Design a protein around this ligand. Structure first.
Ligand SMILES: CC/C(=C/SC[C@H](NC(=O)CC[C@H](N)C(=O)O)C(=O)NCC(=O)O)C(=O)c1ccc(OCC(=O)O)c(Cl)c1Cl
Ligand SMILES: CC/C(=C/SC[C@H](NC(=O)CC[C@H](N)C(=O)O)C(=O)NCC(=O)O)C(=O)c1ccc(OCC(=O)O)c(Cl)c1Cl
Lengths: 208, 208
């Protein structure tokens, strides 16, 4: 079945977990402690020496977005055609770009960079609001009329940003409603409310 | 048909151009000058306010990897099945991670960071050598027995690294032979030797 190998944090596994949960998929969580990691053997066996590591049967994958695209491809959450598949990629790549900046802030320059980051946030979120406005008035999903892996990734990005800068979505009606709507999906809502999600820190250094 | 909108540099368009050329595809190059960019209108119309911008008929795309995946999907350069597709993604995501570090070095910390970067290079290239060693002894492509968009992206990454740190592939026989082999492909060889490629700087700040 599925197995996600990661440290005890939401981080780069939050989106794929929401996906699996919302899709009614079962998966196993292999929690790696900082101690076990610093031992070296696991890291050495990882393709790029990093986590998350994912297992789908005997298929072992690395890279959070590779896992997202894999699940999207195999579960039918990758658009209805090539045109949509490309747009889903465009959204996910944009989410990744911002996630990298967020990660850099959190682990590299939180105290001194937070103000500049938050000030730059609106311009960084604007693209996703525009995307929604161009797709059925933002009433459905980020691309097309069916959910995609990019939705879960974008949703997580928006959620962690609401924590970083409370109210950042207030000026973005479509993104705001989008968050509430997706978060309301039965399986997803239950997952987001569960200890499994709630008692895990967003990041590994206690910052958010 | 196809249109590539970018600044007059190889940068994030080199891989997709090699792909198009090697695949015998025709495309138009719309060169954006620093003056045009600083004018503001183009930037404002770009989804994430950045280039490259790509047009396939009336489909307008942004994000270099979205363009790569789109061409790979539509041209059949994305693996033979879903498993290979996942592996192709895993390779491309790894290429992107290193490309981001390369870009960071080039544009924000060349002088002071070059030594540390080059020293860390071997460990960053090892994953691709390993991937090659696990696929038909590295005699064909990065994933499977057919070329994929990830091959062009990886090839570009390797090429720019040989310029940054001459001889960096000496420690990796498979990657070294891989570069020579792919570069020898008729259409690609002609493209790499053409003014279109050769007279374009790798980066925009004159560093490499
Ligand atoms: C638990 C906190 C930690 C999660 S794992 C982080 C990292 N893995 C990746 O960054 C995966 C990137 C892939 N491209 C992907 O998309 O999957 C990892 O495995 N690190 C272990 C290693 O030895 O490399 C986390 O986010 C984290 C923790 C600590 C630090 O450093 C602190 C600092 O001062 O910079 C960072 Cl930068 C990060 Cl991202
Ligand atoms: C011509 C040099 C320039 C090419 S365009 C760079 C950038 N676009 C992207 O980074 C695309 C990223 C997407 N995720 C993708 O994958 O496609 C861009 O459009 N910049 C214009 C803008 O206004 O944002 C280039 O590489 C470049 C040039 C200058 C600088 O800054 C110098 C510094 O001191 O940092 C950088 Cl960082 C870069 Cl990357």
């Amino acid at each position: 079945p599925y197995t996600v190998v990661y440290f005890p944090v939401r981080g780069r596994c939050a989106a794929l977990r929401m996906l699996l949960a919302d899709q009614g998929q079962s998966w196993k969580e292999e929690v790696v402690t900082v101690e076990t990691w610093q031992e070296g053997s696991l890291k050495a066996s990882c393709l790029y020496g990093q986590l998350p590591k994912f297992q789908d049967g005997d298929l072992t994958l690395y890279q959070s977005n590779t896992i997202l695209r894999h699940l999207g491809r195999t579960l039918g959450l990758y658009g209805k055609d090539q045109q949509e598949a490309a747009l889903v990629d465009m959204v996910n790549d944009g989410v990744e770009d911002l996630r990298c900046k967020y990660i850099s802030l959190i682990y590299t320059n939180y105290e001194a960079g937070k103000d500049d980051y938050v000030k730059a946030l609106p311009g960084q979120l604007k693209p996703f609001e525009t995307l929604l406005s161009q797709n059925q008035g933002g009433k459905t999903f980020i691309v097309g009329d069916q959910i995609s892996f990019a939705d879960y990734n974008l949703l997580d990005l928006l959620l962690i940003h609401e924590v970083l800068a409370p109210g950042c979505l207030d000026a973005f009606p479509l993104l705001s409603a989008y968050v509430g709507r997706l978060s309301a999906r039965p399986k997803l809502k239950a997952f987001l409310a569960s200890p499994e999600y709630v008692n895990l820190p967003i990041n590994g250094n206690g910052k958010q």
